[PDB]
């Protein structure tokens, strides 16, 4: 897997990801807010292709993510993130992928997700989130 | 003056300013750190020329500012920032510009300056600083 | 259940909780640090007795929690926190309770847990954590 680390920004304007219902999450790229202007993050791509792209365009700054959840499971011998859901204060986006395996969830009562880091090989192996006020 | 606001970043790599000892600070521009990379801030220029340029290139991230000080005073009828000094954990840069009028100083015991905002006409009218851990 | 909210503090010195190996977590209490002094949190008690107490005494400030994990699930037809495990930089405490139901985990790469809030009825119904640098 290639490690990635976007670092921290001011907020999130858009999430671009891709998935395959045969397998798991493939690619991941965020358009951040940086001091009220868009900042297009690096595009973190799988080693393989064939995934279905999705674009989550948030109504920034009024709309923001309150919970990220998903499932981890084994795909072809790799334990990876198979599904993601993004719940905002407005709507739920997802699940994307295959909702099968071990669940995880990060609900936020106060604060914002301001950045992502993680590792992508064939699929999204794992990820972390920067949180700020 | 024309207001500017660079916003907040991860740190400071270089400060470019200009000054005239007969008057005050003129231009102001910062190269920020943004998650490990240089971010070239917009150049906030004086409406006039005739200033001496200064570039303060810090040994980021080993070197960081621990105190900003200066003087405000009247120049041609306007209260402006006449002088600036930047002390880091390695060295002191300045004073730049005339060290006369009302002193001010912001020493930082813990934390970092991560952004600038302010206004520049003929001279730097005023400024503020974003601070973070 | 009865809600509780300890607020936010400087760090964690000790956690005193009770649990039953057939049901879930019961009582919960924390000794925080507050600017270098122990702050003895209120003891948030189950409505029922019969639990086993455990005292997790951390070597503050060099020892701190890196991950809280556990399970939520049905007891007596209520969704409750059935188990908790606290992993620090020095060792793992738990699991306490019953490791059955839906797993959750909050691993921390950077930052500190500085407060707890939640609700306890017969069992710990839910909880949240204040995080800070």
């Amino acid at each position: 897997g290639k490690a990635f680390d976007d670092g921290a920004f001011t907020g999130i304007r858009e999430i671009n990801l891709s998935y395959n219902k045969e397998t798991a999450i493939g690619d991941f790229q965020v358009v951040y807010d940086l001091n009220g202007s868009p900042y297009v993050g690096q595009n973190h791509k799988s080693f393989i292709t064939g995934f279905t792209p999705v674009k989550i365009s948030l109504d920034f700054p009024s709309e923001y993510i309150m919970e990220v959840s998903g499932y981890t499971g084994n795909v072809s011998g790799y334990v990876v993130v198979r599904s993601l859901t993004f719940k905002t204060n407005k709507k739920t986006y997802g699940p994307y992928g295959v909702t099968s395996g071990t669940p995880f969830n990060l609900p936020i009562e106060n604060g914002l997700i301001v950045g992502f880091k993680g590792s992508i090989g064939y699929w999204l192996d794992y990820f972390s989130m920067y949180l700020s006020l | 003056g024309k207001a500017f606001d660079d916003g907040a970043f991860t740190g400071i790599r270089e400060i470019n300013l200009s000054y005239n000892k007969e008057t005050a600070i003129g231009d102001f521009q910062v190269v920020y750190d943004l998650n490990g990379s240089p971010y070239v801030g917009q150049n906030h220029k004086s409406f006039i020329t005739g200033f001496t340029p200064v570039k303060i290139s810090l040994d980021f991230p080993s070197e960081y500012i621990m105190e900003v000080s200066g003087y405000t005073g009247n120049v041609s009828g306007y209260v402006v920032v006449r002088s600036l000094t930047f002390k880091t954990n390695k060295k002191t840069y300045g004073p730049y510009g005339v060290t006369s009028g009302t002193p001010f100083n912001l020493p930082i015991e813990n934390g970092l300056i991560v952004g600038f905002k302010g206004s520049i006409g003929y001279w730097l009218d005023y400024f503020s600083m974003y601070l973070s851990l | 259940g009865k809600a509780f909210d300890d607020g936010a503090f400087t760090g964690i010195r000790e956690i005193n909780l009770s649990y039953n190996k057939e049901t879930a977590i019961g009582d919960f209490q924390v000794v925080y640090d507050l600017n270098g002094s122990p702050y003895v949190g209120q003891n948030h008690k189950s409505f029922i007795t019969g639990f086993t107490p455990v005292k997790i005494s951390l070597d503050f400030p060099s020892e701190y929690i890196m991950e809280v994990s556990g399970y939520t699930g049905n007891v007596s037809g209520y969704v409750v926190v059935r188990s908790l495990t606290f992993k620090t930089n020095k060792k793992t405490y738990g699991p306490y309770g019953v490791t059955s139901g839906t797993p959750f985990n909050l691993p921390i790469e950077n930052g500190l847990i500085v407060g707890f809030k939640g609700s306890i009825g017969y069992w710990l119904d839910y909880f949240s954590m204040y995080l800070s640098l």
Partner: peptide, 14 residues
């Protein structure tokens, strides 16, 4: 150091 820090939670997935 001269690098600003922020809370990071995770990883999830493995």
């Amino acid at each position: 150091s001269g690098i600003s820090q922020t809370v990071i939670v995770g990883p999830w997935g493995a």
